[PDB]
Amino acid sequence: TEFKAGSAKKGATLFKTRCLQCHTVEKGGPHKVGPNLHGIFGRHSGQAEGYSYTDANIKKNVLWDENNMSEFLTNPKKYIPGTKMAFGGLKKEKDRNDLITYLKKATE
Numbered sequence: 001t002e003f004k005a006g007s008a009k010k011g012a013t014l015f016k017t018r019c020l021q022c023h024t025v026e027k028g029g030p031h032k033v034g035p036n037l038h039g040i041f042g043r044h045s046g047q048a049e050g051y052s053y054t055d056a057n058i059k060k061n062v063l064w065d066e067n068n069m070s071e072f073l074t075n076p077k078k079y080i081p082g083t084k085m086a087f088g089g090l091k092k093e094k095d096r097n098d099l100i101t102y103l104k105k106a107t108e
């Protein structure tokens with residue numbers, strides 16, 4: 001244990017103001033700058049179809065779990081050096097948690 005549920009709501013506002021600019025969560029939503037993330041958990045890194053991921057992601061070969069996703073979220077360039085995710089990070093444990101709670105939810 002090292003991940004505890006957050007507010008899906010709050011969850012859904014970080015996404016909007018922090019991840020939508022680049023991504024969609026929804027089954028059938030398109031890839032934009034980043035890929036769509038519907039069904040992200042359970043799946044491995046860089047496998048959405050019709051998406052051109054860096055060498056980095058693919059190689060990283062990550063199992064998208066909640067616990068992973070949080071450290072990634074802490075610092076992505078750090079997690080997967082060579083990723084094209086120009087996303088600095090979410091330094092707060094709390095913020096991450098609501099986010100992941102939202103993700104857990106909306107991409108299922």
Ligand code: HEC
Nearest residue numbers: 018019022033034045046047053054057083084085086087
């Ligand atoms: C645009 C400037 C982005 C923002 C803001 C966020 N992400 Fe991102 N994401 C982006 C790219 C360009 C890529 C692929 C990079 C590469 O190495 O090819 C990604 C990848 C992800 C992944 C990996 C998914 C996979 O299928 O392997 C995840 C899980 C992801 N992005 C989620 C995500 C979230 C939750 C964000 C908000 C806090 C977010 N990203 C921001 C581009 C952009």
